[PDB]
Amino acid sequence: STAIFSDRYKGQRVLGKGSFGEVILCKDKITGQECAVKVISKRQVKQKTDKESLLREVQLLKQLDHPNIMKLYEFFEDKGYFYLVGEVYTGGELFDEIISRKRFSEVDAARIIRQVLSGITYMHKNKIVHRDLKPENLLLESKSKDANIRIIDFGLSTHFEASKKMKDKIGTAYYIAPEVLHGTYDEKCDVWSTGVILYILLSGCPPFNGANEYDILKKVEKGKYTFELPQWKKVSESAKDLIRKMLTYVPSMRISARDALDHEWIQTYTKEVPSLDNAILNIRQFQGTQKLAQAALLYMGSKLTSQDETKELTAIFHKMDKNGDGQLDRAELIEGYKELMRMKGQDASMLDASAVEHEVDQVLDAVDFDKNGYIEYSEFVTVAMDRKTLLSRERLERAFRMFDSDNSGKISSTELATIFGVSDVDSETWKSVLSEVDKNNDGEVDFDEFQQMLLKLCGN
Ligand SMILES: CC(C)(C)n1nc(-c2ccc3nc(OC4CCC4)ccc3c2)c(C(N)=O)c1N
């Protein structure tokens, strides 16, 4: 009796999308314990190692315990998926909390960074390297002000090939250690990344920056950065010294996570100082830019997914309609939706037959439909897809409002440049699209215009 994931857990809702897959909030069917399950599709993510190697790693990770590292509880594998069952954390990304503060200082930075260093040190002792460490991988344990930081995804880079899709790689270039690019790397790459995160926490700007991904990688590969911005005047030599040691090019010369923990700056500023307002302002801008480019690409993706699935669902139902009537019953809509799921394999939310049944019922409950006298498939398809798109279009509007910090309703041509640079959409291409939406415009777009540009950039 091999164990099966859905015999034990039922999905409650989606928490979001991370590296390698979807994260679902799940519940144990017997104990009622809540857990965050990372679902990695074997069809979308290629393994780098053999099965042996990964199971060994999973066994080790289940035995490791540290207050700043996500806790893994269980592991399931079936034909199409791996299921990584872990502790649920409700505090969100670090940077999302930081932008909401009214005050931020070198003491707060230092408390953050020594939580990070402490989880890393621990993991390196057990010979586990993160490699893809960045702000998105730092969650707060709870919505409390005093909440601990938990590092997610320690261990996945060793076993899974990262996505080349830009919707997944957005914002990774700032943090990656030069030696990781060239291919010969060890645990010190995690110190580099942390050194970058500290630079951003104290100034609000990345030390290596650029108008697009490859521009950013060129800076990193040269390894040159400076403290020649005005806001570094507000920051102790001590912190700059730690940064220097963490951003040391040659790894053998770069400080270890453990020796970073014993550095003067950490010692001084994590004991019981000016607010860094410019830093917090730059971070609020940097964060907004990223989340808007991210949401742009996920909107484009959602629209493309939708077209794929509308045509597919329509063809499944046309075929299933042996009458030629355009009328299916509940049990068929379900059979068809399920067969969409067999063919795609994209919904972590539809983890079992019962998750599908309920989704169908939510759709039937939406349309003005007698549910126990059979339904017009055309209209079920419309409501079902919109429902899918909803999360992504609502998020787009929200990331747009949050980016528009002065509530002007508009974003300048200069701001778009930065947004499409980060989203790695060719410059000539988006200017060309901006020309065709509003052919009278004056280098600013509202939300409706911006959205039309995106629809045009994904083939519509
Ligand atoms: C914010 C979002 C990205 C939606 N997220 N993601 C997780 C999360 C992250 C990494 C995980 N890794 C797991 O296993 C690790 C063992 C190597 C990967 C298992 C569950 C995870 C949940 C997570 C959580 N655990 O609460 C959460 N809130």
Taking the chain, what is the end-to-end CA distance rounded to the nearest angstrom?
Answer: 50
For residues 45 and 160, the answer to whether their CB atoms sit within 8 Å is yes
Q: Which residues line ligand 1 (CB under 6 A)?
A: 15-16, 18, 23, 36, 38, 61, 70, 72, 84, 86, 88-89, 139, 152-153, 155-156
Query: Could you tell me the two tokens for 259?
Result: 């020796």
List beta partners, residue 297: none
* CA gap 266, 201 in Å, rounded: 14
List beta partners, residue 327: 376
Which residues, in sequence order, are CB contacts of 15 under 8 Å at separation 6+? 23, 24, 25, 36, 88
Domain 91-153+162-285 CATH (choose: 1.20.210.10, 3.40.50.620, 3.90.1150.10, 1.10.510.10): 1.10.510.10
For residues 29 and 8, the answer to whether their CB atoms sit within 8 Å is yes
The domains spanning 1-90+154-161 and 91-153+162-285 adopt the same CATH topology? no
Convert 254-295 into a string of H (helix), E (strand) and C (coil): CCCHHHHHCCHHHHHHCCCCCCCHHHHHHHHHHHHHHHHHHH
Using alpha carbons only, what angle is made at residue 283 by residues 270 and 293, rounded to the nearest 5 degrees?
Answer: 140
* CA gap 436, 349 in Å, rounded: 38
Edge-to-edge strand list for the sheet holding 21-28: 9-18, 21-28, 34-41, 81-86, 72-77
Classify the C-alpha dihedral 416-421-426-427 as positive or negative.
Answer: positive
Classify the C-alpha dihedral 437-212-45-92 as positive or negative.
Answer: negative
Query: Could you tell me the two tokens for 443?
Result: 């280098």
Using alpha carbons only, what angle is made at residue 357 by residues 356 and 358, rounded to the nearest 5 degrees?
Answer: 90
* CA-to-CA separations, 430 to 170, 302, 421, 454, in angstroms, rounded: 18, 19, 10, 9
Convert the chain into a string of H (helix), E (strand) and C (coil): CCCCHHHHEEEEEEEEEECCEEEEEEEECCCCCEEEEEEEECCCCCECCCHHHHHHHHHHHHHCCCCCECCEEEEEECCCEEEEEECCCCCCEHHHHHCCCCCCCHHHHHHHHHHHHHHHHHHHHCCCCCCCCCHHHEEECCCCCCCCEEECCCCCCCCECCCCCHHHHCCCCCCCCHHHHHCCCCCCHHHHHHHHHHHHHHHCCCCCCCCCHHHHHHHHHHCCCCCCCHHHHHCCHHHHHHHHHHCCCCHHHCCCHHHHHCCHHHHHHCCCCCCCHHHHHHHHHHHHHHHHHHHHHHHHHHHHHHHHHHHHHHHHHHHHCCCCCCEECHHHHHHHHHHHHHHCCCCCCCCCHHHHHHHHHHHHHHCCCCCCCCEEHHHHHHHHHHHHHHHHHHHHHHHHHHHCCCCCCCEEHHHHHHHHHHCCCCHHHHHHHHHHHCCCCCCEECHHHHHHHHHHHCCC
User: How much distance in Å is there from the Cα of 64 to the middle of ligand 1?
Assistant: 16
Residue 51 identity (one-letter amino acid) = K
For residues 120 and 138, the answer to whether their CB atoms sit within 8 Å is no
Q: Which CATH class is domain 1-90+154-161?
A: alpha beta
* CA gap 294, 167 in Å, rounded: 6
User: Resolution limit in angstroms?
Assistant: 2.6
Please pick, among 132, 153, 168, 190, the residue that the annotation labels catalytic.
Answer: 132
* CA gap 206, 113 in Å, rounded: 16
Which residues, in sequence order, are CB contacts of 399 under 8 Å at separation 6+? 288, 291, 292, 294, 295, 296
For residues 207 and 216, the answer to whether their CB atoms sit within 8 Å is no
Closest atom of ligand 1 to CA, residue 16: 4
Using alpha carbons only, what angle is made at residue 348 by residues 347 and 351, rounded to the nearest 5 degrees?
Answer: 100
Nearest CA to ligand 1 atom 18: 153
Q: Is 347 a catalytic residue?
A: no
Q: What is the largest CA-CA distance in the chain?
A: 79
370 known ligand binder: yes
* CA gap 192, 48 in Å, rounded: 24
For residues 109 and 62, the answer to whether their CB atoms sit within 8 Å is no
Query: Could you tell me the two tokens for 19?
Result: 């590296």
Using alpha carbons only, what angle is made at residue 213 by residues 455 and 421, rounded to the nearest 5 degrees?
Answer: 40
For residues 217 and 173, the answer to whether their CB atoms sit within 8 Å is yes
* CA gap 376, 328 in Å, rounded: 6
* CA gap 108, 202 in Å, rounded: 10
Nearest to 270 by CA among 69, 109, 97, 101: 109
Which residues, in sequence order, are CB contacts of 49 under 8 Å at separation 6+? 158, 159
Q: How was this structure determined?
A: X-ray
Instruction: Find tokens 């980016």 and name the residue.
Output: 403
Which residues, in sequence order, are CB contacts of 125 under 8 Å at separation 6+? none
> What are the domain boundaries of the chain?
1-90+154-161, 91-153+162-285, 286-460
Classify the C-alpha dihedral 441-447-450-454 as positive or negative.
Answer: negative
Phi/psi at 456 (nearest 5 deg)?
Answer: -75, -35
User: How much distance in Å is there from the Cα of 114 to the middle of ligand 1?
Assistant: 21
* CA gap 292, 288 in Å, rounded: 6
